[PDB]
């Protein structure tokens, strides 16, 4: 599991699908899971517009 250095999206791929950055770090921390963006308070505080695996400390 590698988390992106800009948007924070944790992905298994060679690139973050949401944006498409090749910059993926291994030493990441604090998992955040998103189901809904519009209703969830969590997405608002961080600023994530796409549901799925996001990170905090990279």
């Amino acid at each position: 599991e590698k988390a992106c250095r800009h948007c924070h999206y944790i992905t298994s791929e060679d690139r973050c699908p949401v944006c498409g950055s090749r910059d993926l770090s291994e030493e990441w921390f604090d998992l955040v899971i998103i189901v809904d963006v519009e209703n969830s308070e969590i997405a608002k505080k961080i600023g994530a517009k796409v549901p799925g695996k996001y990170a905090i400390r990279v």
Binding site: F29, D30, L31, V32, I33, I34, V35, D36, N39, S40, E41, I42, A43, K45, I46, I56, R57
Partner: protein, 82 residues
């Protein structure tokens, strides 16, 4: 509303992902979930009703319980911030 949910040792990230499986795929209105690395054996679940949480965790391995009460959003911002 944020509901604190008990989890087994290390099983934080795994049960956090596992709970996400019974959400839309079963028709359960969970908004979000928080699995912070500095938190030991507990998971936050953003849900509207108490039934929503109870229904999600039910039948989920290594996800022991659900806390009596609700966690105020202000107490949760800290982990999300860093």
């Amino acid at each position: 509303k944020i509901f604190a949910v008990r989890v087994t040792h290390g099983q934080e990230e795994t049960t956090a992902k596992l709970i996400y499986s019974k959400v839309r795929t079963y028709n359960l209105p969970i908004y979000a979930i928080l699995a912070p690395s500095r938190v030991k054996g507990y998971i936050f679940v953003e849900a509207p009703n108490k039934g929503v949480v109870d229904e999600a965790i039910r039948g989920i391995r290594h996800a022991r319980g659900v806390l009596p009460g609700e966690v105020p959003f202000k107490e949760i911002e800290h982990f999300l911030e860093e």
